[PDB]
Amino acid sequence: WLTSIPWGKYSNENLDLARAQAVLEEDHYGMEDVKKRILEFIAVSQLR
Amino acid sequence: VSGYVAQEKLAIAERYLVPQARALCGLDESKAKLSSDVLTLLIKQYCRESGVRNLQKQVEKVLRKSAYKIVSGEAESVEVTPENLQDFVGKPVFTVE
Fold this sequence. Notes:
By secondary structure, chain A is mostly helical. Chain A is built from two helices and no strands. In chain A, α1 (about 15-25) packs antiparallel against α2. The interface of A and B includes residues 17, 40, 46, 47 and 48 of A. Chain A: It is found in: Mitochondrion matrix. Chain A: It comes from Homo sapiens. Chain A: This is Lon protease homolog, mitochondrial.
């Protein structure tokens, strides 16, 4: 159980905003507020 | 320990608070100016609590929203101004003491 835990495995993200635009719009109409927040999140992580 | 005078919170936040959140949002002063007057308007209006925690949330919100305007947006240097402010953090909440 101790050895099983990952220590540093870091799934790589997509980081292009465009592809995030699409995939957010593909599957949920509206609810624009949450879309704006999460998009802002990726936009900042790409920076810092 | 006591509460804090409105100006007292000003003297706090310009030194020991804004730079801290600025290091949390990862920005530098070159692109994310915050005049004193915006802070005085903020603390006078949007948060009336003796503790400083609520002002800490506001100033956080403002900074990271500025970051979103940088990383993809237009301006290379956001400049908060009191007329600008209503954009970033919205409409005044409290007024009628």
